[PDB]
Amino acid sequence: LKEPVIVSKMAARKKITGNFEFHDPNALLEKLSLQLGLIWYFDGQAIYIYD
Amino acid sequence: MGNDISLIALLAFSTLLPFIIASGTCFVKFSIVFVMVRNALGLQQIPSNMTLNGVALLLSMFVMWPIMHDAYVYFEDEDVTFNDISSLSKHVDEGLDGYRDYLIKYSDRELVQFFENAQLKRQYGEETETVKRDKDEIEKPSIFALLPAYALSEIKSAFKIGFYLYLPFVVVDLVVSSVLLALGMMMMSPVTISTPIKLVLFVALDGWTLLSKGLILQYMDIA
Amino acid sequence: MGNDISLIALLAFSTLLPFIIASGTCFVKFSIVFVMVRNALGLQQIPSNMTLNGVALLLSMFVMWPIMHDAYVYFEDEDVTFNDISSLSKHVDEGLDGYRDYLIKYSDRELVQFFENAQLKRQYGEETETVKRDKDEIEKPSIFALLPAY
Amino acid sequence: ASEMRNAVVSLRNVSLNEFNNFLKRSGLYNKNYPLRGDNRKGTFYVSGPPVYVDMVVNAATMMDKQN
Amino acid sequence: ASEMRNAVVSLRNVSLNEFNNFLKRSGLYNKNYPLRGDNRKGTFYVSGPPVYVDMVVNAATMMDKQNDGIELGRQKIGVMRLNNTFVGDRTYNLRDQKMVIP
Amino acid sequence: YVDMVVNAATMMDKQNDGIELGRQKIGVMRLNNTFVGDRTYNLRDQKMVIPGIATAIERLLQGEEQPLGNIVSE
Amino acid sequence: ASEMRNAVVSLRNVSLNEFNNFLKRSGLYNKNYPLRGDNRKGTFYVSGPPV
Amino acid sequence: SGYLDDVVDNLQTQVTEALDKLAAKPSDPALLAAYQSKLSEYNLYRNAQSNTVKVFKDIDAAIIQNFR
Amino acid sequence: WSGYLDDVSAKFDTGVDNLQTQVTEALDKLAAKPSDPALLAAYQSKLSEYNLYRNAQSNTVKVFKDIDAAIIQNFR
Amino acid sequence: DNLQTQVTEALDKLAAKPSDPALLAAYQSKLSEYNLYRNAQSNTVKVFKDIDAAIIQNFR
Amino acid sequence: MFYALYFEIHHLVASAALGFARVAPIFFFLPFLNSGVLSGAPRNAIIILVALGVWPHALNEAPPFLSVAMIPLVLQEAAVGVMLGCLL
Amino acid sequence: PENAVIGQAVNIRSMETDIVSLDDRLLQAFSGSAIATAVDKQTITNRIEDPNLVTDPKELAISQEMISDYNLYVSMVSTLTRKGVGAVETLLRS
Amino acid sequence: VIGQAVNIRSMETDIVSLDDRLLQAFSGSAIATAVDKQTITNRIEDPNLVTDPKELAISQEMISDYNLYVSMVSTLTRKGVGAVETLLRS
Amino acid sequence: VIGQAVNIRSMETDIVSLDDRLLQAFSGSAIATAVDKQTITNRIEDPNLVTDPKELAISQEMISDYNLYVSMVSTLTRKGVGAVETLLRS
Amino acid sequence: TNRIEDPNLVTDPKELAISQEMISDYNLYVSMVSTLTRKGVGAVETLLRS
Numbered sequence A: 001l002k003e004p005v006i007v008s009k010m011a012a013r014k015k016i017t018g019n020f021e022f023h024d025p026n027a028l029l030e031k032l033s034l035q036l037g038l039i040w041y042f043d044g045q046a047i048y049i050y051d
Numbered sequence B: 001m002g003n004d005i006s007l008i009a010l011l012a013f014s015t016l017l018p019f020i021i022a023s024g025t026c027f028v029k030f031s032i033v034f035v036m037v038r039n040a041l042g043l044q045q046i047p048s049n050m051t052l053n054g055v056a057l058l059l060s061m062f063v064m065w066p067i068m069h070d071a072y073v074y075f076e077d078e079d080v081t082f083n084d085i086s087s088l089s090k091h092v093d094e095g096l097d098g099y100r101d102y103l104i105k106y107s108d109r110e111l112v113q114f115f116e117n118a119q120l121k122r123q124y125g126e127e128t129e130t131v132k133r134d135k136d137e138i139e140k141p142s143i144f145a146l147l148p149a150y151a152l153s154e155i156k157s158a159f160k161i162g163f164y165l166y167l168p169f170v171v172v173d174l175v176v177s178s179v180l181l182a183l184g185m186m187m188m189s190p191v192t193i194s195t196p197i198k199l200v201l202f203v204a205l206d207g208w209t210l211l212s213k214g215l216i217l218q219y220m221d222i223a
Numbered sequence C: 001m002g003n004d005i006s007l008i009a010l011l012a013f014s015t016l017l018p019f020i021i022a023s024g025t026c027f028v029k030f031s032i033v034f035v036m037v038r039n040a041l042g043l044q045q046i047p048s049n050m051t052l053n054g055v056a057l058l059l060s061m062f063v064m065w066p067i068m069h070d071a072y073v074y075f076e077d078e079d080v081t082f083n084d085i086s087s088l089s090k091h092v093d094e095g096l097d098g099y100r101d102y103l104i105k106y107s108d109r110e111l112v113q114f115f116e117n118a119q120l121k122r123q124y125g126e127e128t129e130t131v132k133r134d135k136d137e138i139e140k141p142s143i144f145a146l147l148p149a150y
Numbered sequence D: 001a002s003e004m005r006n007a008v009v010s011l012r013n014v015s016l017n018e019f020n021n022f023l024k025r026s027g028l029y030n031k032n033y034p035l036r037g038d039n040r041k042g043t044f045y046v047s048g049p050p051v052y053v054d055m056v057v058n059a060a061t062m063m064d065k066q067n
Numbered sequence E: 001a002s003e004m005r006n007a008v009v010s011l012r013n014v015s016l017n018e019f020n021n022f023l024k025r026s027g028l029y030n031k032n033y034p035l036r037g038d039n040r041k042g043t044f045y046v047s048g049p050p051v052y053v054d055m056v057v058n059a060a061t062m063m064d065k066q067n068d069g070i071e072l073g074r075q076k077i078g079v080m081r082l083n084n085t086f087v088g089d090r091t092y093n094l095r096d097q098k099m100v101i102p
Numbered sequence F: 001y002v003d004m005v006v007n008a009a010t011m012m013d014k015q016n017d018g019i020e021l022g023r024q025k026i027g028v029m030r031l032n033n034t035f036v037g038d039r040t041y042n043l044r045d046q047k048m049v050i051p052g053i054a055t056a057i058e059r060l061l062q063g064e065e066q067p068l069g070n071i072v073s074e
Numbered sequence G: 001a002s003e004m005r006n007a008v009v010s011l012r013n014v015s016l017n018e019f020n021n022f023l024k025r026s027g028l029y030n031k032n033y034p035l036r037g038d039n040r041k042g043t044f045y046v047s048g049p050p051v
Numbered sequence H: 001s002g003y004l005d006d007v008v009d010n011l012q013t014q015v016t017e018a019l020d021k022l023a024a025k026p027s028d029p030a031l032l033a034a035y036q037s038k039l040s041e042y043n044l045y046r047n048a049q050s051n052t053v054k055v056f057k058d059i060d061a062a063i064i065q066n067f068r
Numbered sequence I: 001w002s003g004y005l006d007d008v009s010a011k012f013d014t015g016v017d018n019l020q021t022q023v024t025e026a027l028d029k030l031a032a033k034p035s036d037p038a039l040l041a042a043y044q045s046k047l048s049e050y051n052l053y054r055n056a057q058s059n060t061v062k063v064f065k066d067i068d069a070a071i072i073q074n075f076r
Numbered sequence J: 001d002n003l004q005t006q007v008t009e010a011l012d013k014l015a016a017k018p019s020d021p022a023l024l025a026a027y028q029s030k031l032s033e034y035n036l037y038r039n040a041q042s043n044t045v046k047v048f049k050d051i052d053a054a055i056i057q058n059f060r
Numbered sequence K: 001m002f003y004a005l006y007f008e009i010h011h012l013v014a015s016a017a018l019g020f021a022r023v024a025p026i027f028f029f030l031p032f033l034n035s036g037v038l039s040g041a042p043r044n045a046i047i048i049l050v051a052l053g054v055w056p057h058a059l060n061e062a063p064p065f066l067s068v069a070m071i072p073l074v075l076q077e078a079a080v081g082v083m084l085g086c087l088l
Numbered sequence L: 001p002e003n004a005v006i007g008q009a010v011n012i013r014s015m016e017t018d019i020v021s022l023d024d025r026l027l028q029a030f031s032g033s034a035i036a037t038a039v040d041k042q043t044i045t046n047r048i049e050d051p052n053l054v055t056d057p058k059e060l061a062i063s064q065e066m067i068s069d070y071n072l073y074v075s076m077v078s079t080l081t082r083k084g085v086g087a088v089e090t091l092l093r094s
Numbered sequence M, N: 001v002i003g004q005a006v007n008i009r010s011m012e013t014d015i016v017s018l019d020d021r022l023l024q025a026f027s028g029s030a031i032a033t034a035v036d037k038q039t040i041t042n043r044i045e046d047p048n049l050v051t052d053p054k055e056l057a058i059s060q061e062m063i064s065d066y067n068l069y070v071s072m073v074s075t076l077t078r079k080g081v082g083a084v085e086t087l088l089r090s
Numbered sequence O: 001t002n003r004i005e006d007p008n009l010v011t012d013p014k015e016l017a018i019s020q021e022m023i024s025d026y027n028l029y030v031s032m033v034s035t036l037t038r039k040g041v042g043a044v045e046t047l048l049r050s
């Protein structure tokens, strides 16, 4: 992603497993957001992720 | 500081603190166990109660600290301000779950349920029957029911331990008498010889280390 | 005038003093041995519990009073300076090492280490203990860990 | 990363374009964490490492009073 | 290293270039921790060892209040001749009466 | 050394605050081309008064707070 | 020796040369612990035994 | 004081000085008007000091009594 | 070096720029020729203006002392 | 701090011309209102913190 | 000097207080002084009076211990009192 | 400042971790309370020695609050400490 | 505006110099020096300074502090004796 | 009058144990107290209300009622805790 | 009470100067007795309750 990422404490409780390919991160990120129930934002300096 | 009533609540709690420690905490078990060990060895004044209770209080502090710290951090959190009685009360209740869940592992289900049945408003006929789902019934019985069931079950489990501690010394006390009778010295009191044997056995067994460790292991998990 | 918190600490300490003496001082040993010997001689109430406890108390002071006096002489020292809560904590902890050393001398390393684990490990997701190299922790077992082990 | 800070600032005498220039001459300017706003107006948003955010907020708010 | 200290300072009467010269004449300047700012303005930032930072901030703040008695606003006189009219308030006499114009 | 320097400097400073350094001087300036006093003319049907330089300058400066500078046509 | 004491003193009417003469006529003056300052001015330093 | 022992001016001086100047000519309005505000500010200072000293001592007395 | 009731007096003394001297001047001129109606008419104005200046100044400082003393009384 | 600002404005306008009756009339009002405001605020602050002290003294 | 009597009363009570530490343990050991016999309001009133009857220095001059850490001192005196209680 | 608002991105708290000992958790409290009180007392004193603070209603209103907050803070620390040692004493003499 | 400064990175305490005066309850030497001065004085200077508001504000500090110091010693001795009696009975 | 609204229906709950009866009485008092304190604070700083005799006559009562109510709750709580302490000590 | 109602006594400057003393003495007498009795019972409480 070429940006620092900040994860909210409540989101950090969730767990994930498997083999992943970071080929296109923005498209992967939005899909997982929808599957896991996260919300995210980007100010231009860092990506923020919340439950 | 803060809400004037929250301040009153904090001071009331801190006033009742020693009776809670004395009635709803593992201190109840450790206090009994150490005194029973002294009686099993047959000492009337050694160690002092002031030493035994000091040790028991320290050992209990380790077990209880993590719950007090977690509840403190949970309330020292600016996250929200509350719209309504139902929102505030359910926020309060969700903070005690750590303690409620500590009491639930050790009180006994049938006695707990009997006490919960006891609180309900009386009826003229016998009360209308109910069955309730686990998220109240298993997960969330009320604390004014849990607390005495805990105290009673703890006392019981303490007596049980004391029983096992007595057995080897009883064996000693009998054997030594039978050997003195085999030597014919029928008139000598055997207490004068059995007591030091008991002490030797206890130090070679290192009973204090074992007791202090295993009692903590019943509540903590250490690796 | 002085500092209002150091006043609280002084008054509090002086209320706990007899329980500390009764549970973390050689008084524990002296008061026991005498009473045992008295029972073994087979004639209770000679000497009196008053005689025995009185002597045991007096002897304990020869051992312990120099350590307390050394600590107060450490704190009454006009040349120190501090900058932060950490720098003050360190200096106050350093003041207690004279007592800490006595407890370390007369107690078991492994029972001390067990309680040192037990204060934390209910927190811990892990089994590794090497994660701090010993030289700090071996010197700095906490006093609440040392007391019951002593 | 979890320490990032940010602030929002409003200047009553000094335009954003006036301030960026000062940062450049100072050599404090940092293209990885630029200020974000309207060069014409005087309100902006900034975020970054805490010593940087604090330095910016203090310099801008003092210089707003000097002018 | 962790003991570094940082501060922002904002003078009113003493430009940065005014203060640099004082440091140099004093023999207190240090090229590893120079002041960062606009020589023209009076606001700067400083970071470094404690003693250095404290000395800088103190000296600057004293210089500022010392120079505060300097008075800089001044009045001037302009002389202007009229070429086409009488300067003063002007009287005419009518047959029996004076009358006057501003 | 530090304590002696500090106190000596502060007290020498305070012993001078009462000293005054400003001063006033007097300039005598002859007018080469005109009468100093206010002029007045008496005529058959009129009286006319003209203020002098002193009168006009005083009337201009009266009450001024700021210093002067740049007259143009420690 | 570690009981030696120091002070700085600042006169408003009198001056150091005025005061030395007093000590002299008194027979109090001590060349081991003289007053240190500017004879013309009225401020000086003194160090010595307490009395 | 003229004295320091090694190891600005306050309202107490300014009042004594303004009283001293006034008493030379009790009927001058500039001096009277200069003295009213110094005597007022000295009255306020000297009340506020004593009231806060009193608060700090009652705090310490309450602590000692609470641990009796 | 001064408090805030001096800031409040000085707001009058710098507010009425010059009156404090203008009065003395007017008196110096009138004393020389008491029977002159233009001088008399001028002095009446200056002296009245000065009388009001002083009264308004003193009553304002009195009121601010009454506010302060009441706040300090609550420090108890 | 609006009522704190208004009174300092009024005072400057008055000090500019102490004899103007319209200015005097305005200032009288502004100063009186400010005077009541300060007292009311101080008294309620006191009441609110005397209640806390009485609570602590009740369990102490 | 106006306050001298006030200070002279405070020097008295500071001396009595430091004497109590050494006299009270004796009252604990002896069989006709212990609290099985002498109890309630008389007890302190009498102990203090005795301590003032035996303090060795003039009561009206400042106590010499104002410069010293109080706890080591109090424990020292109590230990001495326990030793005297045994010997008597 | 007044023309600026400054947040924290997300308030993670390393000091929420319990990891230190029951006694280090005590020394922190003691050291922090002692420093906070000495600083507060000094500030209150300065606000009274300085003549422009002790004579302006705006400043007096603030000093009143500082004094009351100091009082309440110290009184509560004292109370809770007494209650604490009193619990120990109640249990061990039983 | 004038002379403004602020320390941005760290909370280095500056309103006070942090010092061993944190670590004591009473400045007993400052008491012993003040108590000296108000007791060595016997027929020198003058009596009865009930009336000057500058010295009368210095007496208030001493009259309070010595009363507190004496009150504290009274409790410490009782505590000490009580601790000895507690151990000897038990 | 202008921009005004009221909540018609309160949310509701079961009350089945002394635990819930206690939390409910606590939560009921906390909120009423916070609301009252805020209301008073606003009435002290709206300048139409600080300076009008009719509005001041009301604020006086509100302050009094607040004082009395919080003093009652404090007293009865301390009496209850003291009765428990007395019985268990006995 | 009777002095306060005789209109001759209540309006003559000579007589008022007397009434003021009489009321000041009554006030001091009753405050004295009410203080010393409270000290007196406080002694009995101290000896018996203690």
Ligand SMILES: CCCCCCCCCCCC[N+](C)(C)[O-]
Binding pocket: C058, C061, C062, C063, C065, C066, K075, K076, K079, K080
């Ligand atoms: C008896 C307790 C009270 C007094 C304190 C005694 C401290 C111990 C001094 C022991 C000195 C022994 N010596 C002379 C061999 O070093």
